[PDB]
Amino acid sequence: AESFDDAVEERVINEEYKIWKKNTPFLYDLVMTHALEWPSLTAQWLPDVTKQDGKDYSVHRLILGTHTSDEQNHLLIASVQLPSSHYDNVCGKIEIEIKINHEGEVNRARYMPQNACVIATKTPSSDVLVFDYTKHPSKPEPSGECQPDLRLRGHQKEGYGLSWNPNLNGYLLSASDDHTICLWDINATPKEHRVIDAKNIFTGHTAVVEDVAWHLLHESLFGSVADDQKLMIWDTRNNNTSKPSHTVDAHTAEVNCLSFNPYSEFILATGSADKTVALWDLRNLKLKLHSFESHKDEIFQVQWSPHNETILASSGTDRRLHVWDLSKIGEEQSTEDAEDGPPELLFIHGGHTAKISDFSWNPNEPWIICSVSEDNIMQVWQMAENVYND
Amino acid sequence: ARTKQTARKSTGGKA
């Protein structure tokens, strides 16, 4: 590069990666790398696991998407062979099973927990689509025409935030660049071209709403995060959709993501452009529980471990994925361990050489993550047992 | 807000 600092930075990345590759047998129990035709902006493991009898591997599936320059975009279902002859002329195959025609890049794709065949998608346009992949062929049509099972109206702009209610069937939330949060009941009688209008529109934010998340236990409770630096807590039982139950001045920059703790009904996390992950207690949102510092750039995704209550991970533009352990907060460290980071930082994943777009914890196999980057790479990996043990 | 990169096609390797 033209700048010395720029040329060094590009070289350090390439050099760090070569070291990461050579050190993978020390840090991981599993590393699987796959280069997708196009980069995916989304990643989410489907909940099902198919164990073939007398086979040394199980088949896991994952929802992916495409992001292309000028080609036909697709919603993808990929199969992954994980441990429960394998030589290619690398160890476990990653394959695209379903390709469903999509209009524009898939900003986010999430399955409905009550019917995992149903997947809502965020488009680069105002509509939010719904697809039943069993109501579509495995091979897409060269017609290139996107035929969603439902078109959800209410937004004026594209977005990323998307969350299905785990306790209330068909209740879908969506966040948009238009500053709104839309709610739909996909069970409502559609109209026109399978078009369902927003049941409610929440207008509390005064900037781009980056994410939405339903509380995992209270079916009426959800949280939102925006570029206005706020975290907002909403109750659908209230009739005022312009004022949230709580407004939290969460960060010193844009708030890009949030995730509720799957084991503690009061604990929640937010990720920000201020390069920190904040911990929140719904019982006292005026005071921040803790700040996770060590990310070297804007954070875009936060996800709690589906298996361990004290574990969460964050990813962003710094091309790294950090895994944090709440139980290690305020622990004593030797001066040598202290220089590597805070005790709460359990692991740094340096497998990606580009911005991490999304990641997903495998719900059936503990410590397995799938992360997708802007350079088309998708990694299925698992840190070494010794990292989280002893 | 996030800026989407100008996506590159893979031939079975990075971008």
From Swiss-Prot, chain A:
Keyword Iron-sulfur carried by entry: no
Cysteine pairs bridged by disulfides in the record: none
WD repeat intervals: 101-134, 154-185, 204-235, 250-281, 294-325, 351-382
GO cellular component, one term: nucleus
PROSITE patterns cross-referenced by the UniProt entry: WD_REPEATS_1, WD_REPEATS_2, WD_REPEATS_REGION
InterPro entries listed in its UniProt record: G-protein_beta_WD-40_rep (IPR020472), Histone-bd_RBBP4-like_N (IPR022052), WD40/YVTN_repeat-like_dom_sf (IPR015943), WD40_repeat_CS (IPR019775), WD40_repeat_dom_sf (IPR036322), WD40_rpt (IPR001680), WD_repeat_RBAP46/RBAP48/MSI1 (IPR050459)
UniProt KW Oxidoreductase keyword: no
Pfam families reported in the protein's UniProt record: CAF1C_H4-bd, WD40
Keywords for this protein: Chromatin regulator, Nucleus, Phosphoprotein, Repeat, Repressor, Transcription, Transcription regulation, WD repeat
Places the protein is found: Nucleus
GO molecular function: histone binding; histone deacetylase binding; protein homodimerization activity; transcription cis-regulatory region binding
UniProt family annotation: Belongs to the WD repeat RBAP46/RBAP48/MSI1 family.
Name assigned to this protein: Chromatin assembly factor 1 p55 subunit
Species this protein is from: Drosophila melanogaster (Fruit fly)
Swiss-Prot record, chain B:
Residue numbers carrying Phosphoserine: S10
Disulfides per UniProt: none
Residue positions, PTM N6,N6,N6-trimethyllysine: K4, K9
Modified residues (Phosphothreonine): T3
Compartments where located: Nucleus; Chromosome
Residues that bear N6-acetyllysine: K9, K14
Su(var)205 chromodomain-binding: annotated span: 5-10
Modification N6-methyllysine, positions: K4, K9, K14
Post-translational modification remark: Phosphorylated by the catalytic component of the Dbf4-dependent kinase (DDK) complex Cdc7. Phosphorylated at Thr-3 (H3T3ph) by Haspin during mitosis and interphase. Phosphorylation at Ser-10 by aurB/ial during mitosis and meiosis is crucial for chromosome condensation and cell-cycle progression. Phosphorylation at Ser-10 by JIL-1 during interphase is linked to gene activation and restricts the formation of heterochromatin at inappropriate sites. Phosphorylation at Ser-10 is enriched on male X chromosome compared to the autosome.
Family: Belongs to the histone H3 family.
Role this protein plays: Core component of nucleosome. Nucleosomes wrap and compact DNA into chromatin, limiting DNA accessibility to the cellular machineries which require DNA as a template. Histones thereby play a central role in transcription regulation, DNA repair, DNA replication and chromosomal stability. DNA accessibility is regulated via a complex set of post-translational modifications of histones, also called histone code, and nucleosome remodeling.
Assembly notes: The nucleosome is a histone octamer containing two molecules each of H2A, H2B, H3 and H4 assembled in one H3-H4 heterotetramer and two H2A-H2B heterodimers. The octamer wraps approximately 147 bp of DNA. Interacts (via N-terminus di- or tri-methylated on Lys-9 (H3K9me2/3)) with rhi (via Chromo domain); this interaction is direct. Interacts with Nasp. Interacts (via N-terminus di- or tri-methylated on Lys-9 (H3K9me2/3)) with Su(var)205/HP1 (via Chromo domain); the interaction is direct.
Name of this protein: Histone H3
Organismal lineage: Eukaryota, Metazoa, Ecdysozoa, Arthropoda, Hexapoda
Gene of this entry: His3
